[PDB]
Amino acid sequence: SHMATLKVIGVGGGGNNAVNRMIDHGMNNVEFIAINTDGQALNLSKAESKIQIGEKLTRGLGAGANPEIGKKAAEESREQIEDAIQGADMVFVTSGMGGGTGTGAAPVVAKIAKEMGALTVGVVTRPFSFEGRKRQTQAAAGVEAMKAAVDTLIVIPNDRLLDIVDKSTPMMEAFKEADNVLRQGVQGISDLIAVSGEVNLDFADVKTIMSNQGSALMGIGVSSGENRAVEAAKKAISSPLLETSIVGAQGVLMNITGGESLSLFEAQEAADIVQDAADEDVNMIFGTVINPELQDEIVVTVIATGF
Numbered sequence: 001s002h003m004a005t006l007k008v009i010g011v012g013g014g015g016n017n018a019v020n021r022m023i024d025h026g027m028n029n030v031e032f033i034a035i036n037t038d039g040q041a042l043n044l045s046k047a048e049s050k051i052q053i054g055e056k057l058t059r060g061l062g063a064g065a066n067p068e069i070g071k072k073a074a075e076e077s078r079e080q081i082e083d084a085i086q087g088a089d090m091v092f093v094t095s096g097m098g099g100g101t102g103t104g105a106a107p108v109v110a111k112i113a114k115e116m117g118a119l120t121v122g123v124v125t126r127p128f129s130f131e132g133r134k135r136q137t138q139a140a141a142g143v144e145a146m147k148a149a150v151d152t153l154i155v156i157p158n159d160r161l162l163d164i165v166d167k168s169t170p171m172m173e174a175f176k177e178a179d180n181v182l183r184q185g186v187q188g189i190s191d192l193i194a195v196s197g198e199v200n201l202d203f204a205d206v207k208t209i210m211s212n213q214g215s216a217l218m219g220i221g222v223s224s225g226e227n228r229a230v231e232a233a234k235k236a237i238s239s240p241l242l243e244t245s246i247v248g249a250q251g252v253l254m255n256i257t258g259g260e261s262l263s264l265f266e267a268q269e270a271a272d273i274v275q276d277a278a279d280e281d282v283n284m285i286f287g288t289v290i291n292p293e294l295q296d297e298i299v300v301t302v303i304a305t306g307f
């Protein structure tokens with residue numbers, strides 16, 4: 001009764017890319033769905049479920065950077081999108097904003113998922129500044145449309161990738177770092193749903209922290225040794241890639257996983273790190289999992305909303 005069905009939906013080129021790379025990484029008990037106008041992109045997708053939208057509009061090509069085409073394509077394929085989502089308790093929609101299919105279709109996909117009762121999370125990118133103003137303006141319109149259609153939204157400005165690379169870092173490695181935001185969020189929620197805790201949080205706690213909230217932060221931190229709880233908590237909340245930082249969070253789900261050495265003192269330390277960084281009076285849903293396979297490692301999972 002506890003095993004909520006999670007689906008990750010990539011919409012458009014960048015979304016499809018993220019799905020392919022997450023499948024390559026390995027991720028079980030999550031169903032992947034690839035949605036695109038671009039038939040050739042879908043032919044290369046590794047997702048078990050593929051939905052080609054807008055064939056009568058685009059003749060099987062991509063949207064050619066036109067959000068109107070992405071929106072029309074998704075609206076006309078509503079039933080096929082519904083069929084793929086059916087059964088979902090939680091849907092993550094990922095897309096690169098600024099082109100046509102992601103910008104236009106991802107908000108339609110999210111609205112369909114929300115009206116099917118799924119807890120609906122968007123994780124989307126904004127374009128690099130070097131792509132120019134029209135891409136950014138189109139992306140802004142997509143982001144606003146996404147915000148209206150999801151329960152929670154995580155935006156990754158691609159310009160932040162320029163903050164974490166050196167002059168040689170392969171573009172594909174930078175893209176994998178952006179992928180981690182979505183992948184680790186999904187994994188942390190999957191683990192929370194599946195693993196019974198000593199202070200047990202479940203999918204109903206996820207729904208409470210995320211339903212109808214707007215901006216969100218999802219983070220995981222892992223540390224060991226001295227100060228592990230503080231360091232893990234800091235890692236969970238500190239991503240350089242996020243538009244929405246922890247500052248201003250008024251609601252937090254925090255789950256700590258450790259071995260039998262997990263101390264009460266360090267749990268409070270981790271909670272205090274999150275509360276202080278939010279710089280608000282935070283309402284916390286606190287959970288603890290004891291994994292005796294763990295020795296000195298501690299894992300802190302954070303979901304923050306209420307901005």
Ligand SMILES: Nc1nc2c(ncn2[C@@H]2O[C@H](COP(=O)(O)CP(=O)(O)O)[C@@H](O)[C@H]2O)c(=O)[nH]1
Nearest residue numbers: 012013014017096098099100101102127128178
């Ligand atoms: N981090 C990241 N950003 C991407 C990727 N592909 C594309 N983008 C970005 O997503 C934007 C839209 O590209 P797209 O290929 O998704 C256009 P469409 O949705 O029409 O297919 C691009 O302008 C670019 O900013 C990607 O794999 N990783």
Ligand SMILES: [K+]
Nearest residue numbers: 192195196201
């Ligand atoms: K649980």
